[PDB]
């Protein structure tokens, strides 16, 4: 536990100059947003309880992207 504590203190007190190489590579890329997608399902169909207009952001993400209609175990079995 003392090893934990001293390691965390060492990490905190130090000074850095960059993130990991991967993130520095990622920041070299920039994109461009455009017109919105097409609705995936009808806007007035309840799918998950609570995900409703009073719960805007999940509702909008779900209706824009659409639910995963295929089981994940079999999908990742081939990956």
């Amino acid at each position: 536990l003392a090893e934990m504590d001293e390691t965390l203190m060492r990490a905190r007190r130090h000074s850095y100059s960059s993130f990991s190489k991967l993130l520095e590579a990622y920041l070299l890329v920039k994109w461009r947003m455009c017109e919105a997608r097409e609705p995936s399902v009808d806007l007035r169909l309840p799918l998950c309880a609570g995900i409703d207009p009073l719960n805007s952001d999940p509702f909008l993400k779900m209706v824009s992207v659409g639910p995963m209609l295929q089981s994940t175990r079999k999908y990742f079995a081939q990956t």
């Binding site: 806007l43 007035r44 409703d52 207009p53 009073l54 805007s56």
Partner: peptide, 20 residues
């Protein structure tokens, strides 16, 4: 006071949506 309803809460947001 002003404990109006939950269904009207649902409908009011939708009415906000439909407006354009």
């Amino acid at each position: 006071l002003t404990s109006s309803d939950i269904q009207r809460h649902i409908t009011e947001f939708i009415s906000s949506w439909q407006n354009h």
